[PDB]
Amino acid sequence: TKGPDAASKLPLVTPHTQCRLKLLKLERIKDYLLMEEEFIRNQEQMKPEERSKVDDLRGTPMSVGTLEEIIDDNHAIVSTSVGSEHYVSILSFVDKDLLEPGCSVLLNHKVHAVIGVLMDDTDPLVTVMKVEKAPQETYADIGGLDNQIQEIKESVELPLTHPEYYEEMGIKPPKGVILYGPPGTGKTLLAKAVANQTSATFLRVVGSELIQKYLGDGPKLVRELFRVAEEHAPSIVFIDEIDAIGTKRYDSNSGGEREIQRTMLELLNQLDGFDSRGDVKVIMATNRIETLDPALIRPGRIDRKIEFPLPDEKTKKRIFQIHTSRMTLADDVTLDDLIMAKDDLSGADIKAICTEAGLMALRERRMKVTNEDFKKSKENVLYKGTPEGLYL
Amino acid sequence: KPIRALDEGDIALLKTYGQSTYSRQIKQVEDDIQQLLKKINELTGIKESDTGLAPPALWDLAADKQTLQSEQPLQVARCTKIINADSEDPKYIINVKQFAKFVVDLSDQVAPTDIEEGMRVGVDRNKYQIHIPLPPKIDPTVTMMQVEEKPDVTYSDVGGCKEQIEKLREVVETPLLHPERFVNLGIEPPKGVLLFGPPGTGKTLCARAVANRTDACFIRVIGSELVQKYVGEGARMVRELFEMARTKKACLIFFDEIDAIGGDNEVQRTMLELINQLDGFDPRGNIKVLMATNRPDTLDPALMRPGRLDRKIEFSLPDLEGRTHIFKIHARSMSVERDIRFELLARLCPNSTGAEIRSVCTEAGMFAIRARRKIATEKDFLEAVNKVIKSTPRYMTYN
Amino acid sequence: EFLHAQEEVKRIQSIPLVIGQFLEAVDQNTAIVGSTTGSNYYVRILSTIDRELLKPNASVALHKHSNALVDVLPPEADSSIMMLTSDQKPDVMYADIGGMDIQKQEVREAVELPLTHFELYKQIGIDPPRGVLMYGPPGCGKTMLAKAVAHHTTAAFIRVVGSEFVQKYLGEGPRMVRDVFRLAKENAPAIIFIDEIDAIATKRFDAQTGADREVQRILLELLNQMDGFDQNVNVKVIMATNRADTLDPALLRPGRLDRKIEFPLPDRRQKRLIFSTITSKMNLSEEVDLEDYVARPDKISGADINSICQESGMLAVRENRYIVLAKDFEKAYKTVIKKDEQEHEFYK
Amino acid sequence: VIMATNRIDILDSALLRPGRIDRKIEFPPPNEEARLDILKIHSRKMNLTRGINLRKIAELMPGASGAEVKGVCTEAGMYALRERRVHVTQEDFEMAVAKVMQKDSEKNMSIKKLWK
Amino acid sequence: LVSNVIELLDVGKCAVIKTSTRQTYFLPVIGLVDAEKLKPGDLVGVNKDSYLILETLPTEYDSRVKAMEVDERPTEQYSDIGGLDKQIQELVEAIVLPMNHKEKFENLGIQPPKGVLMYGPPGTGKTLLARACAAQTKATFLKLAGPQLVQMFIGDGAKLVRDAFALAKEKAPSIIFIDELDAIGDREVQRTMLELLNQLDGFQPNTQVKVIAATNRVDILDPALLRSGRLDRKI
Amino acid sequence: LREELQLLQEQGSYVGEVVRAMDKKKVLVKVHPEGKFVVDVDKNIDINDVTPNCRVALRNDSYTLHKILPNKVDPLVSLMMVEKVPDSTYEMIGGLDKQIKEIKEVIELPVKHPEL
Amino acid sequence: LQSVGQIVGEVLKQLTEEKFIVKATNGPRYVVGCRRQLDKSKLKPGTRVALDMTTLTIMRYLPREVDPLVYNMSHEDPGNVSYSEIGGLSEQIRELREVIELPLTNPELFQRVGIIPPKGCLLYGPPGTGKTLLARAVASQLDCNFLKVVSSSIVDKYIGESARLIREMFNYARDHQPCIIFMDEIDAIGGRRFSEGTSADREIQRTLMELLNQMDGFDTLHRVKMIMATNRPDTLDPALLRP
């Protein structure tokens, strides 16, 4: 199988302080891009029977179907995208060894005999579900969550890099990992960081994206997604908001609920389908962990469960340092009164506090955020306990 | 203090005022970087798919043209009631997938004998007459029906389910190993047992252990498979697997996750077909069925009626001795010290299923990996059981 | 030749034609239409078609064999919800509704006067009321006043009941609300009457199940359609309920329900007017104390007075005499307003 | 993106979370000055009479939303319309305020006197 | 091409059909087949192009009834049931004795008992006696459940009970069988028993199909069911 | 008129989303609901302009890529564009001055001058 | 053999004197004409119609499609029970005979007297008192269309289905005048509407609200007389209990 088609990953510029070194590095990257475009264009310019007859035999147009059975070497059971399936022949030129139940055979428009196979069929949905440009966020952009980052690296990175420890100890690599916690703790940021540092194919999925209107399209989409992940091995599948489909299993009455249950049973089956030794891992995030099915999180399916607690005081100050690392703060800003206040501040809340403090600074015609601006911002962004006096 | 909207002069001053001299150049270079990257991605493009053309040594192009002209394409349909053909009404209801249902005759090629209800019929596209039956030819090495002959797990591997393993031994061995004893005790050999218990208790593993001891091949069938895409001809699936089991020597049929099947038109076809293959098939056969699901009631009431599945083995969460035995069994395959107090770990995880125990061992291995140590210590197992199990209160009021 | 070509162009617009939705224009003469057959086609727009009527999602007629955009339809011709036809119009007049002079005036000032004398409102420089709530005890004339309004209106009357909005399929209730309001908007100055509005417009609460969430979604769609982002013009909405206090406060505010008209049980003079207007078609009452019957203090609605007269007619038929007198009228009065209690004495 | 609701408290925490929704702006019922401003905005097209004191009308609407102020303007216009006039007097605004802001109180004094 | 006849309309009869190609069509004339039975739901072989009913086909499975196993051969000879001699004598005299002497019943000018009832502690042989009666009468057996029907949402009234009774009447040496007591918020069971009374009361004249209505206790009794006709014969 | 009559007799062209251009002669496009076909490009359209996930036109039934159509936006959502701007100005809003400034600091200021 | 069958759909709008918007069931909609000889004045919107399969023209009209539960509830034989088989109900049977059948036999008598015929009545009493029998006998005597429905059997788990079933019942009743809808156990659907209440409590209120509007609502009922039987009249809603 073809290896991992990772993201673009342009080299990171380290200074970021708007200095000469940043100019040097950015100009170097631009120089290399220019010599790349020059080469590609010039090599486009420089230098210029049976195939045509086989194209004629194929005809025009040629429909695309999914192979499902192969009775003999000259007959098979293909299914058109509509849903209908036919007992069709395989012409000689079709390379047989590529025929494997679940491929994308090319079918003649009339008498749908197999005239070819499509190695890459990936439908637009699963194609956009594949990460092409790595997110700019990085582990350096994550404050705190040292244990969480360590666990995710042990889960989806250590088997990818030197894995000899895993079989040296005899334990299996953790097939799949799920992140949970209150909203805004860093579940999606930690997946962005993984995608930025990964060396494998990263497949971002919304979870609710897998559900499709037409009957059989949901399980087909899930099957295609994981088939791409395996064929793109090594790969990482990030199904964000798994609770969109991960809710408690209950007996279904309507057709739509039956289709939803079918899609999730397909996802669970295909999660069981690949071995843990395989280099395809799944990563799922949710806020309502308690509402998930107690079969998607089975120890035999998703062993790890990375908790994302609301940041503590030191993690709060780390996040504040990270998000104020690009500000022109004054010398008066303590930043300690804010992390003092016993609240439920999260990473998102701290980032919004920083943004609001910047907006207060703009409101004063000044570009140097002060302690007073942070003070008003914290109250401004914090929305909404025990009556005051009961608990001293 | 009313907020004052930023005037155009303020906008102009704030933009430039304090700024890096290089900032303009930086911004321009970064924008040019993005434009250049877009240009590269635009000018590479058009990656050739190169469809599955075999080397020209295999192209009999004239023959493909002739088979295109001659060989008709047949749509695949699911057959239904025979409507009493008997050479007087040679008609059948066939459901052509999502297209429609029809009532069609035979073909000169086919015969009435090999066409019945339920198999895959290849109908034509004009008259829709059944032109060739296409048995699913399932024999599924691409999916479930484990078909494992002698599972690697043995009698020593299973730990804790001693009462359970003894009841299983009785039912699926004493007839299988000593048929004469049941014959001379005047009783039909146990037709089967339903192994019910909380999930992860290991009932599957205990069954595979006795299968390895019986030296009879172990067949494990999942239910979700034939709930999902491979629905319909599941009756023919179980037909062919029971048939090959008859061709096979002494066997051990095992249905796990059968709750999905038991809990229904094609599904109902599947269990009435297994009724035909259990009641209709003589109960004296060596294809003993091993039913197993957590649900003890979701099974269809017509299934456990006498003359069928006869007893039920109640698996329960392993006890302290069971838990330490499971811990030792799972740690045998791990690089750990020789002085690990597995009784301590068994104590620390009460009401813990076997799957939880294997996850605890895996987490102990991961904890040992974390400190970059080739040997896992007892502290690693303690931390693993602290992490997995439990997902001041018990230390300050109890003592 | 030009006459012949024009005849051919007119002939291509013949029937039958498949209806489609004009998705988006591509050129001056071509467009993308989604035919109701479940497919999208890139077709050719007829030149004679007026262009600015060709708006997105507008229902257009396509040639049967070529899908060419042959002609454009009225904006909401294919509306699922039906209007009130000429024959469907009720025969109740304002005269048949005795009394409720102030109720009639307050309904007319919002549902009738703006449609016929908008110059008055423009001269005064105020927005005429767009929405009235008709609440009170049961059987006091609400639905009759709605029927009378439908009779005496030049508007496009749309009659719905509140429970009709609640659909089995998810998202179909709000869709029906959207379609009925869109039909009213795309039509002439129109009136929407939603009888039993409190079936869906009960006070919003923390819904904990799918059904309650869907009903509150219907209510929210009603609110956002009445006074949402895109305002409606010449679309007056009448809704009647028995329990106004259970209605959502967002529904009971000016701009959505500018007038909450109370329909109390008839008092003294109103009872006399109701008796006179119901016994007008009645036979002569041979000088019975109708004024005293009115004068009796009893909490009876107009429906009860109609019942009293109806019972009088039934008794007169039963004893075979066409002229009612005090005996059968009195028996009818006792029968209708019985108000039997038998309540255990310890309560009072 | 802009969102509006009357019940923020029932909105999900994952949606109210900052970074997804910043600056949760509250629209409190207008105070007396804001009510006067709304009255002057919605009475711009009316034909007011010399001697109209919209400040008194604003003071007559304690805790009244802007929609109720517009309804007060509309009802005063209708009181003018009923007498077939075009100008609107202070008395018209007073009765309009009385009619629009009319609400059901606690009729039972015994229930109302439960609390001190 | 097979179609499901939606209904028959009078014009002299016209029928609208739903062909298996998800299309609904009207027929001014009913094909080349008779048009008197023509049940509203009877599958019909309609023309592939002109769509006229060439001929009618046998009926189809109605889901739960196919799931409602017949077990037509129950294999009892009263030697399986023991200790219930009076009970089986009562059952015989209540079901099969009127079945063969229905003539002596109409001589009296009264109707035969349309359903027997029994009650007793669980495991006392109530189902075994039902199977024994089915064997000795060679009558079709249906094992309708009692606690299962209380669930399955609102709809287990005139959708399954009626389904159980309806198509049993064509393979009709038949004995349909109610089991453990059932409940003979709380509104679904009310609908279930309303369907029971107004469907069992709407029974057959010859009573070729009988109901046996075994229960588990005598504590909960509905007079509308325990009356004559529905459930009067009590064992 | 005669030319229009002539082009009105040709069948409409199906629309479709080209997932990718397989080759300098073949293009694989999904058309709802016929399925996915590997169509060719006629003489007119240059294939380098055939970008993935762009709406196209396929001929009568030969399925030849013959025109590139604007990007697919389904009508149910394309209706949500505010084509006709509503007539409500800040001058007709009483009070809410602070609210207006706060909403402008997120709706206007970021878009207008992101440099700040 | 010569017949070809016809597509069936519902008319949606009358674009002009000839062009009709017609939507075929589970299919697309068209603008179609009508047959030369046909009563265009009756082809109202929503009227089920038949279309020629080829030319797609209005071939013939169809009666409105009847709901399957409405069908089974309307096609139950009353058993032609006479009036003799009631007994001991002389005053009540005479009263109900008046209120139901008198408008169905000599409506001109009511027209002259000066009243509108009463729209229906209630029979309350202990179970087994023969209210169902009395209504069944009334129906047999009148020899008119009779919908015998039992309340608590029209309630459904699906949210909007019970009110829809009530609507379909009354639509059949209006289509098949003269008709008598006997709804037994109205105590089920009809119940003093109250606040709070579980989703079910409210759903039943919504149903009662439909029944109410479907009886005395904007659209006046004609020749459709209702008979409602219950054992608990006291719990009935005052709006339902209102005249």
Ligand SMILES: Nc1ncnc2c1ncn2[C@@H]1O[C@H](COP(=O)(O)OP(=O)(O)OP(=O)(O)O)[C@@H](O)[C@H]1O
């Ligand atoms: N530990 C952290 N350090 C720095 N920034 C953080 C941290 N946690 C969260 N943030 C900030 O919070 C923002 C939103 O976080 P993120 O998208 O990861 O949330 P989430 O937990 O996945 O939320 P949800 O489940 O509600 O969608 C990020 O863009 C980031 O700037």
Ligand SMILES: Nc1ncnc2c1ncn2[C@@H]1O[C@H](COP(=O)(O)OP(=O)(O)O)[C@@H](O)[C@H]1O
């Ligand atoms: N008694 C036992 N001895 C050893 N391992 C066990 C035991 N019970 C469960 N396990 C472990 O559980 C895992 C599989 O459990 P499984 O048999 O699938 O559970 P179920 O009871 O649901 O079939 C295996 O890895 C096995 O090692």
Ligand SMILES: Nc1ncnc2c1ncn2[C@@H]1O[C@H](COP(=O)(O)OP(=O)(O)O)[C@@H](O)[C@H]1O
């Ligand atoms: N003002 C009135 N004048 C004459 N008849 C009235 C009046 N009010 C009520 N009625 C009688 O009562 C009935 C009105 O019922 P309706 O208005 O539908 O009650 P609701 O208030 O529940 O809508 C009418 O049929 C009419 O005969």
Ligand SMILES: Nc1ncnc2c1ncn2[C@@H]1O[C@H](COP(=O)(O)OP(=O)(O)O)[C@@H](O)[C@H]1O
């Ligand atoms: N008198 C009896 N003779 C023989 N077997 C009996 C007798 N009574 C009960 N049984 C046994 O009990 C079982 C039937 O129980 P039963 O009471 O019919 O079921 P339920 O109580 O669930 O309706 C059968 O296996 C039957 O063999």
Ligand SMILES: Nc1ncnc2c1ncn2[C@@H]1O[C@H](COP(=O)(O)OP(=O)(O)O)[C@@H](O)[C@H]1O
């Ligand atoms: N006058 C009568 N009063 C009560 N019941 C009677 C009368 N005449 C006959 N019956 C019997 O009562 C039964 C009627 O039941 P039904 O009408 O359902 O009672 P209810 O109306 O109380 O439900 C009939 O089967 C009949 O045998």
Ligand SMILES: [Mg+2]
């Ligand atoms: Mg997230």
Ligand SMILES: [Mg+2]
């Ligand atoms: Mg009313």
